DNA sequence: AGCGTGGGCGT
DNA sequence: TACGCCCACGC
């Protein structure tokens, strides 16, 4: 499977979904359609723009279950929680 | 630590 | 196709 192959020369990436290839090809086109209004930096992806903006606002939605420490991203919290192991 | 950013995916 | 999650890697 993975019928959607990248057609850029030296690239061998292949994908299961059409939209995956369309997203991937932005690495080659350099297209960064999503701009931060605060610092004007451009981003390849809407979801990464959203987490980037928390760097300006200080928004930290994700609290550790053990100690309550807050993080901008779920994966930051995930990396953190395991420090509480023995 | 703080966070850029691609892949896989559900919707 | 978009939107926005988790996941993972990288610095
Ligand atoms: Zn490619
Ligand atoms: Zn910004
Ligand atoms: Zn904690």
Residue numbers in the entry: 335 to 420
Give excerpts from the publication:
We investigated the response of the zinc finger DNA-binding domains of transcription factors early growth response protein 1 (Egr1) and Wilms tumor protein 1 (WT1) to different forms of modified cytosine within their recognition sequence, 5′-GCG(T/G)GGGCG-3′. The three ZnFs of both proteins bind in the major DNA groove. The C-terminal fingers (ZnF3 of Egr1 and ZnF4 of WT1) interact with the 5′ triplet (GCG), the middle fingers (Egr1-ZnF2 and WT1-ZnF3) interact with the central triplet (TGG), and the N-terminal fingers (Egr1-ZnF1 and WT1-ZnF2) interact with the 3′ triplet (modified GCG). We kept both strands of the 5′ GCG triplet in an unmodified state and modified both strands of the 3′ GCG triplet.
Egr1/Zif268 and WT1 showed slightly higher affinity for the fully methylated sequence by factors of ∼2.8 (Egr1) and ∼1.8 (WT1). In Egr1, the methyl group of 5mC in the top strand makes van der Waals contact with the side chain guanidino group of R351 at position −7 of ZnF1, which forms two hydrogen bonds (H-bonds) with the 3′ Gua, forming a methyl–Arg–Gua triad. The interactions with unmodified C can be inferred from earlier cocrystal structures of Egr1/Zif268 (Pavletich and Pabo 1991) and from the C-terminal ZnF3 at the unmodified 5′ GCG site. E410 at position −4 of ZnF3 adopts two slightly different side chain conformations. Both appear to be in van der Waals contact with ring carbon-5 of the C, and one might also form a weak (3.2 Å) C-H…O type bond with carbon-5 or carbon-6 (Horowitz and Trievel 2012). The interaction corresponding to the methyl–Arg contact is absent, but some stacking between the C ring and the side chain of Arg at position −7 continues.
